[PDB]
Design a protein around this ligand. Structure first.
Ligand SMILES: NC(=O)c1ccc[n+]([C@@H]2O[C@H](COP(=O)([O-])OP(=O)(O)OC[C@H]3O[C@@H](n4cnc5c(N)ncnc54)[C@H](O)[C@@H]3O)[C@@H](O)[C@H]2O)c1
Ligand SMILES: NC(=O)c1ccc[n+]([C@@H]2O[C@H](COP(=O)([O-])OP(=O)(O)OC[C@H]3O[C@@H](n4cnc5c(N)ncnc54)[C@H](O)[C@@H]3O)[C@@H](O)[C@H]2O)c1
Lengths: 295, 295
């Protein structure tokens, strides 16, 4: 079948595309290359440079299923104008849903985020917890979810919403690991929250496993958390990154959720999926990957 | 203080403006006159014809509190293009929130809808029930709520979200009562769901009473149902309208929520408010009001 992957030129998207290609799917990538790169696009995938903010972004693009992973990266949320978060998330997602409805797309796999929970009262956070986002980005993802669920109930466009915790691995050009490497690259002698980290390989496997199970279900909409079972502190990451680079710098402490960890009991019970690496191991591996890419 | 009322030229909005003016507030009306009318605007209010779909709709407009009631009317939801519902509700609301944030507005009174509940499992429906909209309009209102709550928690722009059931009264130019009158006006001999109806007078009083109590609270966000305690069936309304017009026509049965009734226990307990008319009485009065306006 034909699979459309928005944001397929980005971090998670490019890795998702690679696995879909390995599985034999005909993959169509749609990306405006704002944060993604052509070098990350699998040679077997068909790239279409379009901007999801445009209502007619999908003109001439056909697919049976769409993995909507396009959006501005989830980082430095307080430094980006609210309108940007709104347009790149809420408007883009609505345009994807309208395209899906009008073209007869049967399934929408929406890349959501733990930010929809904001500062959750329960951690690990179960899917049952309500929307309490503290950032515009988180509100935008939550709004995207509401619209997706409605299109599923009203137009039959089924949707699996994947609420990702922190995902890390090769090709990553944003996030705490990236920032630390670039800082040490600036000054290896000096280096200026507890969250769950999942290696991109595990994240992609979990996502595809959930999608398969979802396609074997009849529920119009389903939200599922995707992340590791443990978590690591900022200072731990800083330590790991330094060791990988063989450095011993001085740590200098100079709407962002402080603590985050999603409960993945539903995912594991539904698919039998299990993480292959702990948060600390995923961070270490990623640092080694990015070292060859950035150092 | 200065009070901004978007959609103040419409049904609920014009009546809200009238009461605010009677209370002594300096009212500023912002309306694009798409469904509202200049004849409904109180002489003491300052009218500004702007389109909320424009990011800079509020340039030069200042206010301490904003009653955001602007939006396309909640009717014939399946006949209007999804993009229209999205733009007039989600985009418009976001632009109102950004304006409120950038201008220092302290309170946003958002006109929400029972449609955010969709086909609720519990009826009367308590505020605790989750978002399960079955129409694009309902998803748009729910998304508006999520954004409002986030702006309250993040930027301090406090918001009271009023989930209205069906409101009826003078100046109404849409809805079942209006449609029935126009049909009988077309042919008084022939006339081609159970919901709660509240006379606009009661709706405005409840809204203002809730706002006052909300301003005496410290909670960033609050959602409150506003509607009658009872309900009436479509055939009952048809009967009432006919009697008012002194007619005896033949009833011919030829994403819309089928059954709706909101629990108003929170509202009554918080403000001591009580409806002055039953659903059937509100419908009868409205028919008498519209008779003089349309017949
Ligand atoms: N830890 C994580 O990486 C993480 C966590 C939570 C949620 N997510 C979600 O996963 C998805 C991918 O995130 P990522 O980390 O890979 O970020 P990324 O920036 O690497 O990937 C996003 C892709 O979307 C593309 N894009 C952005 N706006 C577009 C537009 N208007 N039109 C077309 N393409 C557009 C970007 O160019 C990029 O290629 C996003 O929805 C993100 O919210 C990621
Ligand atoms: N039973 C009801 O009347 C009911 C039920 C549930 C919710 N509501 C909500 O109450 C509010 C008012 O509803 P109403 O029944 O009075 O409908 P209405 O159409 O009479 O009033 C809406 C007003 O908003 C104005 N408007 C629309 N789009 C605009 C834009 N882009 N820029 C500026 N102004 C714009 C319209 O011209 C109109 O004057 C809406 O938010 C509606 O969703 C009403």
């Amino acid at each position: 079948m034909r699979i459309v992957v928005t944001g397929g030129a980005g971090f998670i998207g490019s890795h998702l595309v690679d696995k879909l290609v390995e599985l034999g799917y005909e993959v169509v990538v749609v990306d405006n290359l704002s944060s993604g790169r052509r070098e990350f696009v699998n040679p077997s995938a068909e790239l279409h440079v379009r901007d999801l903010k445009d209502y007619s972004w999908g003109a001439g693009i056909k697919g049976d299923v769409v993995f909507h992973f396009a959006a501005n990266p989830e980082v430095r949320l307080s430094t980006t104008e609210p309108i940007v978060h709104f347009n790149e998330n809420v408007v883009a997602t609505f345009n994807v849903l309208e395209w899906a409805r009008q073209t007869g797309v049967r399934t929408v796999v929406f890349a959501s985020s733990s930010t929809v929970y904001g500062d959750a009262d329960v951690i690990p956070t179960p899917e049952e917890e309500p929307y309490k986002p503290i950032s515009v980005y988180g509100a935008a993802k939550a709004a995207g979810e509401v619209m997706c669920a409605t299109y599923a109930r009203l137009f039959g466009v089924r949707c699996l919403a994947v609420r990702y915790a922190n995902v890390v691995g090769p090709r990553l050009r944003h996030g705490v690991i990236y920032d630390f490497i670039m800082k040490l690259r600036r000054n290896p002698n000096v280096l200026e929250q507890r969250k769950s980290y999942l290696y991109v390989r595990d994240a992609v496997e979990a996502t595809l496993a959930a999608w398969k199970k979802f396609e074997e279900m009849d529920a119009p909409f389903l939200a599922l958390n995707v992340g590791n079972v443990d978590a690591v502190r900022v200072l731990d990451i800083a330590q790991i990154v330094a060791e990988v680079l063989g450095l011993r710098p001085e740590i200098r402490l100079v709407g962002d959720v402080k603590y985050m960890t999603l409960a993945v009991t539903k995912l594991m019970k539904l698919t039998g999926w299990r993480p292959t690496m702990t948060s600390a191991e995923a961070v270490k591996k990623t640092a080694e990957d990015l070292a060859k890419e950035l150092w």
